[PDB]
Design a protein around this ligand. Sequence first.
Ligand SMILES: Cc1cc2nc3c(=O)[nH]c(=O)nc-3n(C[C@H](O)[C@H](O)[C@H](O)COP(=O)(O)OP(=O)(O)OC[C@H]3O[C@@H](n4cnc5c(N)ncnc54)[C@H](O)[C@@H]3O)c2cc1C
Ligand SMILES: Nc1ccn([C@@H]2O[C@H](COP(=O)(O)OP(=O)(O)O)[C@@H](O)[C@H]2O)c(=O)n1
Ligand SMILES: [Mn+2]
Ligand SMILES: [Mn+2]
Length: 554
Amino acid sequence: SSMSYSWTGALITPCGPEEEKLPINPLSNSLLRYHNKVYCTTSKSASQRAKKVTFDRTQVLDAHYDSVLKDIKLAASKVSARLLTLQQACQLTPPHSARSKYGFGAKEVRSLSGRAVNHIKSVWKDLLEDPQTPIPTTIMAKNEVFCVDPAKGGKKPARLIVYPDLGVRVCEKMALYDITQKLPQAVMGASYGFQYSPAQRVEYLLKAWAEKKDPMGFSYDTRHFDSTVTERDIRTEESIYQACSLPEEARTAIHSLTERLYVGGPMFNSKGQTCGYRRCRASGVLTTSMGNTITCYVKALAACKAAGIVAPTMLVCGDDLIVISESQGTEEDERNLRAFTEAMTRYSAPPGDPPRPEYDLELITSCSSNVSVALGPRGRRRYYLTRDPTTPLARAAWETVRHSPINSWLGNIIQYAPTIWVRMVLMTHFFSILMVQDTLDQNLNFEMYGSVYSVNPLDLPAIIERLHGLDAFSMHTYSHHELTRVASALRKLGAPPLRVWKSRARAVRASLISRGGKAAVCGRYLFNWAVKTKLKLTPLPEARLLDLSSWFTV
Ligand SMILES: Cc1cc2nc3c(=O)[nH]c(=O)nc-3n(C[C@H](O)[C@H](O)[C@H](O)COP(=O)(O)OP(=O)(O)OC[C@H]3O[C@@H](n4cnc5c(N)ncnc54)[C@H](O)[C@@H]3O)c2cc1C
Ligand SMILES: Nc1ccn([C@@H]2O[C@H](COP(=O)(O)OP(=O)(O)O)[C@@H](O)[C@H]2O)c(=O)n1
Ligand SMILES: [Mn+2]
Ligand SMILES: [Mn+2]
């Protein structure tokens, strides 16, 4: 039926500058050596990304989907949501969020400057009163940093980002913000993924695998998900929102937003030229993650009914998906996943990689992360969440005039603290730099789902214990997979081997303990793995005092 995009063929122009790599990346050139392999996407590769995401889509709904949708709209019916006040909505604007054509910006919006408050009042009135005219959107390349893959044809092209004006975005929060904070949890329950700390996520997969008598899991990511959301998906989700107990002013605005923005609108490049028209999900609206994750839930859950996936347990993070279910022999299980894929493709959510039933939890990957196991001193199996370190390393090497990679180092040390690569590579380089910089106690930002939290480098031991527990400073024997992947990435990036890092880590332990105080606790804990004779670490009193709830939620 419907064509995802159409293109006037104007360029997808960049937004401001696109910083270049420098001839010395002086923070990360003691980390890895092949700074050529570390590249950043760019509006140049936008034309190529355009060509891969455009295609006529044909959706084929059936009674499994119809059944599922109703059980979800009934789950949504249990919801009460409230409008956000124009001012609440305003103060949710991120401090550096892209400014408005009408000369004002995140600065003024969060300050409740009267100029903006007015123009946003006039936006929201026109939202309620006119429920048809399209809302112009801006399309721009997305810039993000990757390592090259010569197997994947070199350098990825830049993901497309489409978003409305800054005044608009605040009204989406007035109409919809409250729903984003409740509906995914009300519809899916524990199937909802973005509520779990890494350890909590691991506990869930473990709980699920254990309660099958013969489990079988697989993962599913949809190829170019933002472009396979059809106009009927986006309206079907508006009727999921409308299932909720809402005030009448909200429903009007919601409906107007769906008709005028969400189901599609003309896209403008940064120079203003009409760039094309969009008939799919704009990645950039408030509902981008709620909408993906819920649309994904039904499609995948209906396709589950359609394949005869037995006793399925689901974990949905955006378009990524894990399904630990009941096995029907290796022979039938294979057959079902084809039915799954076919069903999904019939729903306009075709995969990039054909799913495959797996029977070993380490071999199942989704959300770029997998589970894994290590022994401790106790000879006892401890499970953790790890991932391919090739990209986190690459982003640890992004140094330009304008961006310093250290926040990224924090982010990883926090998120994948138990990993052999964080413990032995990142943590080593982190403190090694901070101490020489003599900024070991200057605060750092840790970013996650758009929230930023203030984090001080010397608190890392108690933070990591509240999130991962003391077992994180005692991982004895890593899996043969992890050992191979970590080795493999260090080679691929010209970083020194893990043997080397053990020598350098010994040193950082010395200076850290020799600074005493908090620095010394970082030594004895974060680098206990490094020493011939391990100190018996005990709980930290600070750990019990920490509130890390909203970190890994939404
Ligand atoms: C609602 C939401 C908002 C986010 N906002 C920001 C932000 O403003 N600035 C920033 O630097 N990072 C943002 N992120 C990414 C976030 O910081 C983490 O990196 C995120 O958990 C992805 O982890 P990952 O790279 O291992 O998953 P991935 O390997 O990237 O797999 C993709 C899955 O994770 C989600 N995801 C990954 N990257 C993003 C992204 N930029 N935006 C939205 N979803 C993403 C997708 O929903 C998808 O389900 C956001 C993530 C979510 C889910
Ligand atoms: N940096 C990012 C990455 C993904 N996303 C969204 O989350 C979805 C995840 O899809 P993905 O990461 O597997 O890549 P695609 O399949 O969309 O090409 C995207 O379609 C986008 O809608 C985003 O909004 N910002
Ligand atoms: Mn995808
Ligand atoms: Mn994905």
